Amino acid sequence: GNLKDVEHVVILMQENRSFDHYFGTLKGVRGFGDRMAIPLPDGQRVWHQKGSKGEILPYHFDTSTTSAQRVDGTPHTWPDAQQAWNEGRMDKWLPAKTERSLGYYKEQDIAFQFAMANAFTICDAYHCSFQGGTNPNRLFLWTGTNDPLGQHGGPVTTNDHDSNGPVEQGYTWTTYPERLQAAGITWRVYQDMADNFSDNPLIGFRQYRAAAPDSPLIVNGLSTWKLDALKRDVLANSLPQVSWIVAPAKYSEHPGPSSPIWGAEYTSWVLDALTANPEVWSKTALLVMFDENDGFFDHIAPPAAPSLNKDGTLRGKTTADATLEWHTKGDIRYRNQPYGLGPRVPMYVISPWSKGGWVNSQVFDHTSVIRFLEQRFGVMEPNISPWRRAVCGDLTSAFNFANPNNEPFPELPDTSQADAIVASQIKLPKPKPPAVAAMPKQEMGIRPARALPYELGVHARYRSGGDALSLTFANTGKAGAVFQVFDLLDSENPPKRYTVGARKRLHDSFQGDASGDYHLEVHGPNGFLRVFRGNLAAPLPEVRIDYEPLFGNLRVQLINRGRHPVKLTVKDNVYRQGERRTVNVPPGQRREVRYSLRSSGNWYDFSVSAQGSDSFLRRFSGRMEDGRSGFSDPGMGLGTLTF
Ligand SMILES: [Ca+2]
Ligand SMILES: [Ca+2]
């Protein structure tokens, strides 16, 4: 059993919902109970958003007492997405997106969505491709790019080509369906051309605008084939190899014309069509995701290339060329910022090879959908930037192709009363933040988790008469990754970002402050954390963490480069009830401690401190990958609680 058993890929991109907005309270995903949330400039965790009325924490949109089923939508364009993200500080959601940005649903409000996630596989590191709105993000899905170099009609930061227009003003880069067409791969866009909410970006391209009505580009890309036609194709065993579905406005899940319950109803209709023929369904993978987050808050700091400085230098470093990531033309606002990745959105992977309520925490974006098609059918998309190929995955890790399951679907909630539900709930008052802000809560509980291609380290070195801490960002795994470095002693400048491709390393230096103090928090994928605190101006302790996955062990090297011995204590923070070990390390030597991580499912969270220092700290947390499936963080729900 393997990827070649997929005969049909179906892609349903809905509209305008962030991951936390739906699933911040879903057990077993990285939600409001995240133990590894990033800090804001004031030193509090990212939840503590502030605006003109003070702090507004995430708060529940209660569809039983308010009209939040039809909440008023929030800003979602390039400038306000960049404003909220604020170069990765993640601290301006309220002025950029309004107080409605911080509202979230719970299970009782969106039962169908929860049931889909619990029946299949939910991706909790799937990001939209572009910070802003609709057509830029959909251009990444269908073509891999928004033309950042601006010589084929871009750069695209607006929706101004989401409709028909003069041939000579159409975009002129190549679309992925054209490459499929030429390779003989069958493909179709299912939509109503009279009501597709301008959610088909192919209409913006010269080669489609100029095409004859019997062109395969028009017949398959810009014609009306509704869900009745989809179901007929499934029953006839004539479903294409690659299908996109583009919902009507009312059913798109967008807050403007739609709602979660109408989006669920339409998704249910898609499921009814695709399951109509069991033989066809047994060979089908359905991907359901969102084009962007509206302006709804999501707390995960998006992976992104370093920003471009005025002098051509970068703030951060990258092993992968990031030329195509920077906004350098067009809109004068936010020049030299990266275009993405944008905030997390829901991605559901629904197939015979993705049942069971799994979570997958590999970083993906909309180009990952194309990458999945590259892996399966072999048609390459050269528009995808090298940075996106390094940092975003190909979706294959979201499946287990060796264990197909062709039983009937679990029951999913009924959506037939959607119209009556909305009609009743719009009679309720508009949702508002609570008078007293309170932290959101996520229930504890573990979810089976897919194996991830990540093996990462951050190794520190400092010198006695030195001015700075040297960090090595080491990627010894099979997929690239972004490390985000927060300087907890600098509340003004933005965090630095380091892109390290698979089997590579980067190095940088980090200065002490006036006293020689440093305090750095380094975040990576799926809860990866390395903390460095100390003073640079007796023992000189250091640690080096290495994985021994074949034996299920973590190797902790305790190093002393100083002239006197030091007692170093290794303390568990959450998985072993605060277990501690103490090691005396002679001058100019090192000593080793090994931990078997079997009892915690390869999760670890330890802090190393030195007797006689109130400041020195090395903290390390994450999950040690070993190629086998695992579980979500058993501590999800605990927030910053530590022993
Ligand atoms: Ca949208
Ligand atoms: Ca739209």
Side-chain angles (χ1 to χ4, degrees):
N2 57 63
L3 176 61
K4 297 293 201 179
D5 292 333
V6 180
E7 302 290 359
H8 312 279
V9 182
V10 182
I11 302 157
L12 171 63
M13 184 173 267
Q14 295 286 80
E15 288 283 299
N16 290 56
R17 301 290 167 167
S18 84
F19 188 90
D20 278 338
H21 169 75
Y22 273 10
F23 295 137
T25 72
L26 177 66
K27 287 182 272 196
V29 300
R30 193 164 299 264
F32 293 132
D34 188 356
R35 300 193 317 99
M36 299 290 142
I38 59 143
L40 299 172
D42 77 344
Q44 298 194 89
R45 295 302 107 176
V46 65
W47 324 109
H48 294 270
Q49 294 292 313
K50 296 167 204 80
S52 59
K53 311 298 171 236
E55 172 185 272
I56 303 181
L57 294 166
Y59 62 89
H60 180 209
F61 278 157
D62 183 353
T63 63
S64 76
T65 61
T66 76
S67 59
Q69 190 82 236
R70 290 282 286 144
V71 64
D72 288 333
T74 56
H76 53 283
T77 68
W78 169 249
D80 49 75
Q82 282 289 325
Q83 182 189 357
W85 175 66
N86 195 21
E87 307 188 84
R89 298 178 184 92
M90 288 277 286
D91 65 333
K92 300 291 187 182
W93 286 90
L94 289 164
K97 302 300 199 167
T98 85
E99 61 185 29
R100 303 187 300 280
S101 172
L102 274 286
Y104 63 86
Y105 301 118
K106 294 183 187 176
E107 183 167 7
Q108 55 263 35
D109 306 294
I110 51 163
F112 183 88
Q113 285 81 355
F114 268 64
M116 270 204 308
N118 280 321
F120 290 101
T121 294
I122 182 68
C123 295
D124 74 343
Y126 184 98
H127 290 262
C128 64
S129 290
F130 177 95
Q131 288 278 16
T134 294
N135 208 46
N137 272 289
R138 287 181 174 273
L139 285 167
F140 277 93
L141 183 70
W142 267 274
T143 85
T145 185
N146 69 332
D147 190 29
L149 301 181
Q151 308 301 304
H152 293 79
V156 184
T157 59
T158 76
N159 296 338
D160 68 11
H161 282 64
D162 72 4
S163 67
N164 192 27
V167 168
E168 292 86 353
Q169 290 178 136
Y171 300 142
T172 59
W173 65 97
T174 304
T175 71
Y176 193 61
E178 287 165 85
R179 310 193 203 273
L180 296 179
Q181 181 66 32
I185 300 297
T186 56
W187 64 279
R188 182 157 288 192
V189 182
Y190 292 88
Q191 72 207 314
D192 185 353
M193 288 301 301
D195 187 359
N196 68 359
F197 201 24
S198 302
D199 278 348
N200 185 333
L202 302 178
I203 201 156
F205 283 82
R206 182 170 193 141
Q207 57 270 33
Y208 290 82
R209 292 174 174 192
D214 65 337
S215 168
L217 297 185
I218 300 305
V219 173
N220 292 308
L222 291 171
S223 296
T224 292
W225 310 101
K226 301 192 284 215
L227 297 186
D228 62 333
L230 179 65
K231 187 169 185 175
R232 285 194 299 270
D233 292 344
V234 171
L235 286 170
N237 194 20
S238 68
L239 185 69
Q241 295 174 288
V242 182
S243 302
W244 292 267
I245 303 175
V246 185
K250 177 184 175 176
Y251 293 104
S252 68
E253 223 150 327
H254 195 296
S258 189
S259 65
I261 188 66
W262 281 324
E265 187 182 24
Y266 186 88
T267 302
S268 196
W269 296 338
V270 169
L271 291 177
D272 172 83
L274 297 178
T275 60
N277 179 330
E279 180 169 291
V280 174
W281 173 251
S282 76
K283 304 169 176 201
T284 299
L286 171 65
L287 308 172
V288 180
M289 81 302 300
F290 289 76
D291 76 313
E292 27 74 357
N293 59 298
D294 206 60
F296 295 120
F297 172 79
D298 185 79
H299 80 277
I300 292 293
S307 61
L308 182 56
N309 288 323
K310 307 79 177 163
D311 61 8
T313 72
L314 304 196
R315 174 165 190 82
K317 299 189 182 178
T318 175
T319 62
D321 288 321
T323 301
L324 298 172
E325 297 299 306
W326 294 306
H327 180 64
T328 70
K329 295 175 161 75
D331 191 332
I332 65 84
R333 295 168 293 187
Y334 299 101
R335 292 283 183 81
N336 293 350
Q337 294 302 318
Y339 280 121
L341 307 182
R344 292 190 304 171
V345 302
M347 160 66 105
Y348 316 79
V349 180
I350 300 169
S351 77
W353 313 276
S354 58
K355 296 178 184 180
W358 291 80
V359 62
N360 174 294
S361 304
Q362 186 175 353
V363 171
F364 301 130
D365 79 330
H366 302 330
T367 76
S368 299
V369 175
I370 297 178
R371 296 268 310 283
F372 183 67
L373 300 178
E374 296 183 330
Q375 292 301 121
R376 173 55 183 85
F377 300 113
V379 178
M380 302 304 289
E381 182 42 79
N383 297 335
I384 300 172
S385 82
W387 187 90
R388 301 283 165 125
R389 286 193 180 273
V391 169
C392 301
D394 64 17
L395 299 184
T396 61
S397 70
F399 302 83
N400 178 5
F401 293 111
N403 284 116
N405 176 317
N406 300 303
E407 306 174 26
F409 278 16
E411 172 187 347
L412 299 172
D414 172 52
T415 53
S416 70
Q417 307 298 301
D419 290 343
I421 288 165
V422 175
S424 188
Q425 289 180 9
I426 61 173
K427 297 187 185 155
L428 300 173
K430 296 287 196 298
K432 298 285 157 291
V436 189
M439 273 284 293
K441 293 179 179 179
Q442 178 184 17
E443 280 206 319
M444 298 192 74
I446 64 165
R447 199 171 281 283
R450 298 294 185 200
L452 303 177
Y454 289 135
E455 186 178 77
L456 307 171
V458 188
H459 309 300
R461 175 58 185 282
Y462 62 97
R463 298 178 184 281
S464 53
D467 50 314
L469 185 72
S470 172
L471 293 184
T472 299
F473 307 88
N475 186 337
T476 55
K478 292 183 195 259
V482 178
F483 302 86
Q484 314 227 17
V485 178
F486 296 80
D487 184 344
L488 274 60
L489 301 178
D490 182 343
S491 64
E492 280 299 292
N493 292 290
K496 296 173 187 146
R497 300 182 293 273
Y498 296 85
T499 294
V500 188
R503 312 177 74 178
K504 302 186 179 189
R505 319 190 305 259
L506 288 175
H507 318 265
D508 212 353
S509 297
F510 301 80
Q511 284 279 285
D513 72 358
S515 314
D517 290 327
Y518 60 93
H519 186 173
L520 302 169
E521 242 181 64
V522 186
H523 292 255
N526 195 26
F528 179 87
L529 179 77
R530 298 291 190 266
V531 182
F532 307 87
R533 193 178 64 206
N535 183 277
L536 300 167
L540 302 172
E542 190 50 77
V543 312
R544 187 193 175 88
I545 310 303
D546 281 296
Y547 310 108
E548 300 177 340
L550 293 179
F551 298 150
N553 298 324
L554 190 72
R555 178 183 174 199
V556 180
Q557 291 188 56
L558 304 171
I559 303 157
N560 181 5
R561 296 191 172 97
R563 286 134 301 288
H564 287 297
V566 63
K567 266 165 51 61
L568 297 175
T569 295
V570 189
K571 171 144 179 110
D572 164 69
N573 291 310
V574 77
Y575 297 112
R576 293 153 75 111
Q577 298 276 306
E579 181 191 83
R580 86 162 194 205
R581 295 187 191 169
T582 301
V583 177
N584 300 75
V585 185
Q589 296 189 49
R590 48 180 72 204
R591 298 283 184 273
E592 293 189 345
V593 166
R594 273 179 181 78
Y595 292 93
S596 172
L597 301 185
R598 273 190 226 285
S599 74
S600 55
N602 279 13
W603 289 93
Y604 61 93
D605 192 342
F606 295 100
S607 287
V608 176
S609 59
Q611 195 196 23
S613 177
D614 267 314
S615 70
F616 179 83
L617 172 67
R618 298 287 185 268
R619 180 175 176 191
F620 38 105
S621 192
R623 193 193 182 273
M624 175 174 72
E625 296 289 329
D626 61 8
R628 313 301 195 269
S629 66
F631 291 95
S632 57
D633 183 359
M636 198 75 69
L638 294 173
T640 68
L641 289 170
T642 55
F643 286 107

